[PDB]
């Protein structure tokens, strides 16, 4: 598996607006919220749990990076994998996506897989 | 062994001016480069290999304190142990020293083993 | 091995302009795009994987050092050992080089293994 | 479990006012007291112990966030769980509820469980 | 053991002024020098060796927090335990106390155990 497979989606030119940490199924979980940084779009929620999916070896590196982009409020390209989490009380509250990467987008072009 | 032994030298009122990280023999390290307060004396490179010396346990604690002082750029005092790592080309690049301690220096007097 | 072998390379007066954290083969990776400090040259990319190459024991030391040299945006020297990772999609998307150290350029010249 | 069930409880629009880390029974712990940003209501105190509760694994994640939201001063929706501790004197000084989560409340909505 | 025991002492309105990360007997340590925020009293030192005393597990948590209050410069109330360290040249250098906790301080009262 790879962050930039053809099966992964990505939303370029996004800014992280709202963070949230907790714990589910005895595993910690963070979560971020993104809105378009250039006028309008659709807000997308996506976040990963520490011991659930195949992206678990990256929870520590992504949480340190998602808190780095939430801190400066810059434009980023987020790679996600839709329809990962299945907990209804939590899927309907946050999302069903799973964060799998965090690129850094320049003025008009981003830096990462496409 | 102690950071404030008699076999260890120290230089007061130094300023961490350059931070170089890397890896030699499957072990990370970092060789800071510190200059004096008013640009006097000579620069003092002091490496710290992760798993090669007897000062290995404090490699992580000395890295975070040598980065916090390289960023804020304030007075420090480093303790080293000379004549280590007989490797020829390594010493010619940085030094024959090993970072052993890092004390925070005030305006008049520092805070550590004199 | 060592960062400053005779089989390595070095790009003084570069700037870490972007940063992408992800994961490949259950192993978090991070890449950095280095543009020249005066906008000239070509974008030089050099990734780093946590448990793939022989430079794996220094992943967390290079991830935290790039993420700090990317914030300050200052000039550095990136050491690369080319022809390491052979994943074709990874190569044409990011690079074929390999981050094996990160020095700190100065007003006169860079400190580190030439 | 999760930080957003009816068996839990929260106090929205709050702001982390104080933070205390120590050690109880060979285990670290941290606690926060939450007061509004307009001079209203009664402060709400939460706690979390490293290995003496069911909120043990997320101790390091919550400490990273409770120390981040404490520095940004933004309005935080802070969740708790009532009557989880048992030490009689420990409750008489800080609290009896747990610290389970830390959202990022906005002026209109609240990105968190409710 | 606890942080708010009557056996353990406490000093209020303490501003952390110095910091020193070294290594003794194959274990790192750190010592802080807290000073009154008014100019009265005496500066008290409270070291914390990695694995030597009963306050061993909270070395990492009290080192991250001692660096926070030392940077922001906010007044806190520290709690210590006297007559702990016994190495001759170590006690004569900093102190014989052991840092057990770190409570934040408001304008009127402190958020600590009394």
């Amino acid at each position: 598996e790879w962050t930039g497979d053809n099966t992964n989606a990505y939303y370029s030119d996004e800014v992280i607006s709202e963070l949230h940490v907790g714990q589910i199924d005895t595993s910690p979980y963070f979560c971020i919220k993104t809105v378009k940084a250039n006028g309008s779009g659709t807000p997308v929620v996506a976040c990963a749990v520490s011991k659930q999916s195949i992206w678990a070896p990256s929870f520590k590196e992504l949480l340190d990076q998602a808190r780095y982009f939430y801190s400066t409020g810059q434009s980023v390209r987020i790679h996600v994998q839709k329809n990962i989490w299945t907990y209804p009380l939590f899927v309907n509250t946050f999302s069903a996506n799973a964060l799998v990467g965090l690129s850094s987008c320049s003025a008009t072009q981003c830096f990462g897989p496409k | 062994e102690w950071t404030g032994d008699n076999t260890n030298a120290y230089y007061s009122d130094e300023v961490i001016s350059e931070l170089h990280v890397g890896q030699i023999d499957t072990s990370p390290y970092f060789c800071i480069k510190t200059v004096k307060a008013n640009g006097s004396g000579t620069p003092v490179v002091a490496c710290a290999v992760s798993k090669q010396s007897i000062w290995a346990p404090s490699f992580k604690e000395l890295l975070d304190q040598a980065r916090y002082f390289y960023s804020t750029g304030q007075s420090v005092r480093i303790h080293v142990q000379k004549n280590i790592w007989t490797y020829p080309l390594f010493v010619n690049t940085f030094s024959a020293n090993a970072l052993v301690g890092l004390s925070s220096c005030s305006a008049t007097q520092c805070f550590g083993p004199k | 091995e060592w960062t400053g072998d005779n089989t390595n390379a070095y790009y003084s007066d570069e700037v870490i302009s972007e940063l992408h954290v992800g994961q490949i083969d259950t192993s978090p990776y991070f890449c950095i795009k280095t543009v020249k400090a005066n906008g000239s040259g070509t974008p030089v990319v050099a990734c780093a994987v946590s448990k793939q190459s022989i430079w794996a024991p220094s992943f967390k030391e290079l991830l935290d050092q790039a993420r700090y040299f990317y914030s300050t945006g200052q000039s550095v020297r990136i050491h690369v050992q080319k022809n390491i990772w052979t994943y074709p999609l990874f190569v044409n998307t990011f690079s074929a080089n390999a981050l094996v150290g990160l020095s700190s350029c100065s007003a006169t010249q860079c400190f580190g293994p030439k | 479990e999760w930080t957003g069930d009816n068996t839990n409880a929260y106090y929205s629009d709050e702001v982390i006012s104080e933070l205390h880390v120590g050690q109880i029974d060979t285990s670290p712990y941290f606690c926060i007291k939450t007061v509004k940003a307009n001079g209203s209501g009664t402060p709400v105190v939460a706690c979390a112990v490293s290995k003496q509760s069911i909120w043990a694994p997320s101790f390091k994640e919550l400490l990273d966030q409770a120390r981040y939201f404490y520095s940004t001063g933004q309005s935080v929706r802070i969740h708790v769980q009532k009557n989880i501790w048992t030490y009689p004197l420990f409750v008489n000084t800080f609290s009896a509820n747990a610290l389970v989560g830390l959202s990022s409340c906005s002026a209109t909505q609240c990105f968190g469980p409710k | 053991e606890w942080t708010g025991d009557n056996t353990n002492a406490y000093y209020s309105d303490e501003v952390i002024s110095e910091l020193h990360v070294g290594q003794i007997d194959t274990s790192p340590y750190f010592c802080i020098k807290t000073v009154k925020a008014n100019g009265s009293g005496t500066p008290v030192v409270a070291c914390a060796v990695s694995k030597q005393s009963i306050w061993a597990p909270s070395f990492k948590e009290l080192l991250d927090q001692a660096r926070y209050f030392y940077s922001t410069g906010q007044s806190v109330r520290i709690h210590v335990q006297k007559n702990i360290w016994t190495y001759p040249l170590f006690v004569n250098t900093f102190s014989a106390n052991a840092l057990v906790g770190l409570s934040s301080c408001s304008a009127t009262q402190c958020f600590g155990p009394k």
């Binding site: - | 980065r67 | 914030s71 | - | 660096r67 926070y68």
Partner: peptide
Amino acid sequence: FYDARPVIELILSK
């Protein structure tokens, strides 16, 4: 001129 807020949160964190 770089934003000091991420650079400050970088050295204080962890």
